[PDB]
């Protein structure tokens, strides 16, 4: 159930060789989805944004104040299927502001997503968001 | 040591939802590299081609006749580090025409690659090459 998440920054040279910088951090696979491998360019999405990107992105979604979106178009899990329908290979939720979403995401689900749904919080959520907020271009790799 | 490889074709709709088609096939992780997760757009590369692509591609390389390239610029493994230096997250070798490369690739290597090096052959190699030869655009996901 523990997800290892690596976030990669990269730059190429005149030589055409890449320079990379990697950050590791920890989250949990939701029972909502598959406990599998995923890797792709990060696309930061507002949660309301899930009420076009090239196939295979990893959505990063910071859940809002539950009393900021008291009447949500879809449930957290529905949002994640919506993301996958639109080409996401993985969804990471930052559930810091909305910890209650954990209970909904570790409900087992008959008919669960075929792709991973990871949640982070705490320090790991901060390190993730520090990068995705800074760099326009990053790559996430999810495992374990 | 067994690698599960999925090759994904995809098409989007006017709605912005993707239609996908997936093929599974089997290979082996080389000891040359890490027995880890990898996922990315496939880039078919001629082996001589490894004597610019966006970070995170999966190289697919059909090894040539050993008596076609009797004096190779680099070893099979060197070619794979070269691929990774140029942004590959994974290398798949089709070692059908050159089975001898297996012995070189299952040498343990102090200082092994940090990314996976998979080899396929037989029927699995055929299914892989059938797709990468047909579709300009595919995505590989490697695991297990």
Residue numbers in the entry:
A (entry chain A), B (entry chain A): 54 to 104, 112 to 204
Quoted passage from the original study:
Rspo (R-spondin, also roof plate-specific spondin) proteins are evolutionarily conserved from fish to humans and have well-documented roles in a broad range of developmental and physiological processes resulting from enhancement of canonical and non-canonical Wnt signalling. Direct extracellular interaction with Rspo proteins inhibits ZNRF3/RNF43 activity.
The ZNRF3ecto crystal structures revealed a distinctive variant of the protease-associated domain topology. Formation of the observed crystallographic ZNRF3 dimer in solution is further supported by the observation of almost quantitative spontaneous crosslinking of the S90C variant of mZNRF3ecto that introduces a cysteine close to the dimer symmetry axis. Notably, the β1–β2 hairpin shows less conformational variation in the liganded ZNRF3ecto dimer structures, always maintaining a tight embrace, consistent with the Rspo2Fu1–Fu2 interactions contributing an indirect stabilizing effect on the dimer via the β3–β4 loop. This stabilizing effect provides an explanation for our results showing that Rspo2Fu1–Fu2 bound weaker to monomerized mZNRF3ecto E92N, E94T but stronger to predimerized mZNRF3ecto S90C than to the wt mZNRF3ecto. Consistent with these co-immunoprecipitation data, Rspo2Fu1–Fu2 simultaneously bound to ZNRF3 and LGR5 in SPR binding assays with the monomerized ZNRF3ecto binding weaker and the dimerized S90C variant binding stronger to a preformed LGR5ecto–RspoFu1–Fu2 complex.
